[PDB]
Structures are given as structure tokens and as C-alpha cells.
Write a structure and sequence with these properties.
CATH superfamily of the largest domain in chain A: Prp8 RNase H domain, palm region
Number of strands of chain A: 8
Strand order of the largest sheet of chain A: 7-6-1-4-5-8
Largest sheet of chain A: 6 strands, mixed
Number of strands of chain B: 10
Oligomer: heterodimer
Strand content of chain A: 15-25%
Helix content of chain A: 25-40%
Distance between the termini of chain A: 36 Å
Order of helices and strands of chain A: EEEEEHEHEHEHHH
Radius of gyration of chain A: 19 Å
CATH class of the largest domain in chain A: Alpha Beta
Number of domains of chain A: 2
Protein name (chain A): Pre-mRNA-splicing factor 8
CATH architecture of the largest domain in chain A: 2-Layer Sandwich
Region (RNase H homology domain) (chain A): 7-237
Number of domains of chain B: 2
Structural class of chain A: alpha/beta
Organism (chain A): Saccharomyces cerevisiae (strain ATCC 204508 / S288c) (Baker's yeast)
Bound molecules: 2-cyano-N-[3-(trifluoromethyl)phenyl]acetamide
Strand content of chain B: 15-25%
Shape of chain A: globular
Region (Leucine-zipper) (chain B): 244-265
Radius of gyration of chain B: 20 Å
Shape of chain B: elongated
Distance between the termini of chain B: 42 Å
Structural class of chain B: alpha+beta
Largest interface: A-B, 11 and 8 residues
Number of helices of chain B: 12
Largest sheet of chain B: 5 strands, antiparallel
CATH topology of the largest domain in chain A: Nucleotidyltransferase, domain 5
Order of helices and strands of chain B: EEEEEEEEHEHHEHHHHHHHHH
Subcellular location (chain A): Nucleus
């Protein structure tokens, strides 16, 4: 059934699984028209499909042209997501296909189940975790490739950079979700934390800076402080 | 008018005949039911006084043979049987009518309720849902499960209703996933009507039979089938106009006949609120919506 704190280590066993987040699929700016009405303008989006064991990120960029002439876009966005995830699974060799797909929002369950009817043995699961994957577009290199896309495009990343050389996938995922939770709660502060020191750079082939083990501990502590703070600044505590 | 003779009534039992019912005391001189209208299927059903568990009964059509009821003390139930000796049966029925040992099927002349509940129900189709080909009548009880229930375990004793499953490859054309899931017209009209049922009469007949088994026996899988067949129509944007008008009449009389006290178990809140207030056909069921709102406004 649903994924929660009780069955959290299952994410890091050797059964291939993917998280699918659809938050950033259908993105709009809201603006005033000349007549003083309101309208939306779509901007490029992305499906965030992540292997939590390996860090492999299948970033399917959603170009605004896919919405042209369509109605009920927030509903279509769920089905488009499910179509693209199903096409991704079909594109993978059988031994790379996931045994479970975990959707971060329950409204993706029926669209994905219907698109995956051909794969009855792939479990489509919700989760009770409040995962911060919406903040993926706060990672500069991911935001950049989404905004620059002129057509539909899949781009492959490892969201853990080289961390798994030194840490386990449980620890890497916990780092990732802490970084993303921070970026979601206070993006400017989080990004200041990550880049304040100019001597630590981001490798061309990486998403995050090249922190030493000790520097990650400092960074990680700064993100927790940020999240706790904002949680005070928010509730006044 | 036809007759169903009872050898005897050895155990106290509530006997139903269609929507009517009466109590028979242990060893009361009861020898059956007379004046049963020709032209309709009927159901004679039983609930023992000592064990309200297992309502059970028999669908039959007196045009298809001479049927009677004999209690079986080994299997512990009232059994329907067929008398092939027509002269035996006429002689046995005339004796019991002369001794006035029978109840009269108590139809008010104004009253079209039973016709309205069984309009599309045919014995031949019942016998394909309830498989026991050596008999002309069909036994149903509270506990029988449906083919679909058995997929999710004795096949001989199953209700072989048509399997409807909105998240199935039968229901969803590759490449039309979102279209077919949000508007089930393809599944209703092409797969089910044209493909499986052949016409809307057979569809309505199975819907009506499922409702009746749900109401008379508390058969849970029948209730599931009834609601699925309603929902399949209401969730289709394209439905023949005559089907919608007939559906509205069908459901109206089902809701009218339902015991007020069984609505909590026989009616699925989600299905009804979706069909009457959200679905494509939310505005096409005027009679049904009006009787539902006046009789069960709590469900909605
Ligand atoms: N003898 C014998 C078996 C048998 O066939 N008995 C039988 C047949 C037809 C109707 C009736 C009833 F009216 F007494 F119910 C009984």
C-alpha cells in the first residue's frame, strides 16, 4: 500500500523503484489582460522521475506546446505525466523496469494505473511522506535545461552527483530531501548557504557543490537551522 | 394465472413471492401460491424463522413448466422441483384449491410494480447467469459470489454476471487512456452493448436481475453489479436517448420498491452522488433524482 515512515528503508533495497512527482509539469504565470481580466501563460515544465537507490533522475521536459489547444490543463497534466512515465518504462530494458512506482500526489494514482495496465506486475503506490520534490526547479542546472527547451526532451541526471562513492543511498536521499526542503522553505537563504564560499565549486558534470565530508556536515547543519528558523518565522516561535 | 403447490410446510418460514411476503408457521396447512401472473418471471424466496441467515429462492417462469416446492429435511431447505406429469400436477393443484389451502398472488390491478422491475428480465438470460442447466428455474441465495468476486471460490455456485471493470484493458483503448477513463462511452456502446450484450434490453435485464438479487437476498456481489452497470451508463457522455429515459424509469421503480430501512446497505453513496450530481448524465435522470432526493436525502 502507501509509503510512509514505517516502511522507509524499502526505498533503498534492491527492488527497482521510481518516485514520480508531477508538481512541475503544468506551470503558469498569472497576469492581467488589457481588458483587466486574468489569464495564464504556460511556461515549460518537467516530470521528476527519480530512482532513490541510484540517484538516476529521468527529467522529462514538458514543452508549453503540449498544452496548445487543450482544455482542463491541470487534469491533462496528470494524464500527460502518466503517458510519459509509461513511455519511459516501455523504453527501458525489462531488467531495468521498476517493480514499483511511487507517486508523490494521490491524484496521479488513477492516471498512472490506467496507463500502466500493460504492466500489471508494476505496483503503483502512493506515499504519506511530504517529499519536497517540487523544489527541483530550484536546482539551477535543472531549471536551466527546462527553461531553454524548445521541444520535448528527456535529460538524464544523477541527483546525488558522486555522493554514493562515499555515503549510502539512505544517507544520500536524506541529504537530498534536506537540501530540497530547505530550497522549498526559503530558496534565497538555501542558495546562499550552498554557494556562499566561492572556493567550493560545482563540477561541470554535477548539480551541487564539491563539498568535503566535513563541509557537508556544516552545510547540512545550516539547512536544518534554516528549516527550523523559517518554521519559527512562520509560526512565531 | 398459474400455481406453485407446496407438498407441505414443515418449518416456520417467511415466504416471499416477488415483492410480497407472508409468514407460515411450523406444520401450518399451507399448500402454495395461486393466481400467479403469466407473462413475467417470478421469484419465490425463503427466510427460515430459526435461521434468518441465508435468504434463498428460485427464479422461474410458469410458462416453462409446472413447478412446486417440497421441503427437504436432509438439506434443510425448501426446494423447487418440476413436475413432468401434467395430469398429476393439475390434479394435485385442483385438490388444494378446492380445499383453499393456497395464498393468492395479491396483485392490485392498478399496480405495475413487478412489470416495472422485471421489464427486461428473461428466464433464458437468468439461466446463463445462474448455471444449472438440468433445471428450468434458478436458485440464488445471500452468500453466492460473482465471477468477478472470485477473480479477486466454487465456480458451479457462482453468479456469472458480465464483468465490468473501469481500469481494465477491455475498458481502455491503448492511446485513448484518459479519454476512455473519463468518458466511458466506448466501453458502454462498443464493448458492452454492441459486443457483449448485443442490445440495451439484455443490459437492462441483467441490471434489473442484479438489483432484485441484491434486494431480495442481500446478495452483496449483485449489489456491486447493479451499481457498476448504472455507473457505466452515467459515466458515458454518449448514450442513446431512449436508453437514458428507460434507465430513469428502471431506477425510479427500484428506488421506489427498496425497503426504507435497507437503504444504508443497498445503496452506494459514491455511485449515486456521482451519477446524479457529477456524471455526464447528472441531468438525465429526473424521476430517479426526484425520488432519491425525497426518500433518501441523507445518502446525498
Ligand atoms: N409422488 C411424488 C413426487 C411428486 O412429484 N410430488 C408432487 C408433484 C407435483 C406437485 C406436488 C405438490 F402439490 F404436492 F406439491 C407434489
Amino acid at each position: 500500500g502507501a509509503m510512509n515512515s514505517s516502511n522507509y528503508a524499502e526505498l533503498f533495497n534492491n527492488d527497482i523503484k521510481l518516485f514520480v512527482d508531477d508538481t512541475n509539469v503544468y506551470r503558469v504565470t498569472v497576469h492581467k489582460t488589457f481588458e483587466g481580466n486574468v489569464a495564464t501563460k504556460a511556461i515549460n515544465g518537467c516530470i521528476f522521475t527519480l530512482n532513490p537507490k541510484t540517484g538516476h533522475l529521468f527529467l522529462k521536459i514538458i514543452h508549453t506546446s503540449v498544452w496548445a489547444g487543450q482544455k482542463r490543463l491541470s487534469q491533462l497534466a496528470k494524464w500527460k505525466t502518466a503517458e510519459e512515465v509509461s513511455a519511459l518504462v516501455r523504453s527501458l530494458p525489462k531488467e531495468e523496469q521498476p517493480k514499483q512506482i511511487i507517486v508523490t500526489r494521490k491524484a496521479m494514482l488513477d492516471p498512472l494505473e490506467v496507463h500502466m495496465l500493460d504492466f500489471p506486475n508494476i505496483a503503483i503506490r502512493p506515499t504519506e511522506l511530504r517529499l519536497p520534490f517540487s523544489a527541483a526547479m530550484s536546482i539551477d542546472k535543472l531549471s536551466d535545461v527546462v527553461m531553454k527547451a524548445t521541444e520535448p526532451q528527456m535529460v538524464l541526471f544523477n541527483i546525488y552527483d558522486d555522493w554514493l562513492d562515499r555515503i549510502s543511498s539512505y544517507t544520500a536521499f536524506s541529504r537530498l530531501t534536506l537540501l530540497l526542503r530547505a530550497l522549498k522553505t526559503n530558496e534565497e537563504s538555501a542558495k546562499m548557504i550552498l554557494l556562499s564560499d566561492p572556493t567550493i565549486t560545482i563540477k561541470s558534470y554535477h548539480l551541487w557543490p564539491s563539498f568535503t565530508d566535513e563541509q557537508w556536515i556544516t552545510i547540512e547543519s545550516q539547512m536544518r537551522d534554516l528549516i527550523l528558523t523559517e518554521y519559527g518565522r512562520k509560526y512565531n516561535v | 394465472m398459474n400455481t406453485v403447490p407446496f407438498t407441505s410446510a414443515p418449518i416456520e418460514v417467511t415466504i416471499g413471492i416477488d415483492q410480497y411476503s407472508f409468514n407460515v408457521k411450523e406444520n401450518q396447512p399451507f399448500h402454495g401460491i395461486k393466481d400467479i401472473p403469466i407473462g413475467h418471471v417470478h421469484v419465490i424466496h425463503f427466510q427460515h424463522a430459526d435461521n434468518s441467515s441465508m435468504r434463498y429462492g428460485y427464479w422461474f417462469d410458469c410458462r416453462m413448466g409446472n413447478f412446486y416446492i417440497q421441503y427437504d429435511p436432509k438439506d434443510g431447505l425448501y426446494k423447487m422441483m418440476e413436475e413432468r406429469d401434467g395430469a398429476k400436477f393439475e390434479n394435485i393443484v385442483h385438490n388444494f384449491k378446492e380445499r383453499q389451502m393456497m395464498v393468492s398472488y395479491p396483485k392490485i390491478d392498478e399496480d405495475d410494480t413487478w412489470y416495472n422491475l422485471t421489464e427486461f428480465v428473461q428466464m433464458d438470460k437468468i439461466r446463463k447467469i445462474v448455471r444449472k442447466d438440468e433445471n428450468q428455474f434458478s436458485y440464488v441465495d445471500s452468500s453466492m459470489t460473482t465471477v468477478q468476486e472470485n477473480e479477486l471460490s466454487d465456480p458451479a455456485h457462482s453468479l456469472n454476471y458480465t464483468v465490468i471493470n473501469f481500469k481494465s484493458r477491455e475498458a481502455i483503448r491503448p492511446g485513448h487512456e484518459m479519454e476512455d477513463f473519463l468518458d466511458k462511452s466506448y466501453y458502454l456502446n462498443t464493448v458492452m452493448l454492441q459486443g457483449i450484450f448485443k442490445n440495451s434490453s439484455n443490459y437492462f435485464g441483467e441490471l434489473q436481475f442484479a438489483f432484485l438479487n441484491a434486494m431480495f437476498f442481500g446478495n452483496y456481489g449483485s449489489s456491486l453489479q447493479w451499481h457498476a452497470m448504472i455507473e457505466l451508463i452515467c459515466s458515458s457522455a454518449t448514450v442513446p436517448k431512449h436508453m437514458l429515459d428507460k434507465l430513469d424509469e428502471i431506477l425510479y421503480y427500484q428506488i421506489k420498491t427498496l425497503p426504507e430501512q435497507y437503504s444504508d446497505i443497498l445503496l452506494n453513496e459514491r455511485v449515486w452522488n456521482i451519477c446524479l450530481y457529477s456524471s455526464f448524465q447528472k441531468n438525465s435522470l429526473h424521476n430517479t433524482e426526484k425520488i432519491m432526493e425525497n426518500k433518501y436525502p441523507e445518502l446525498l
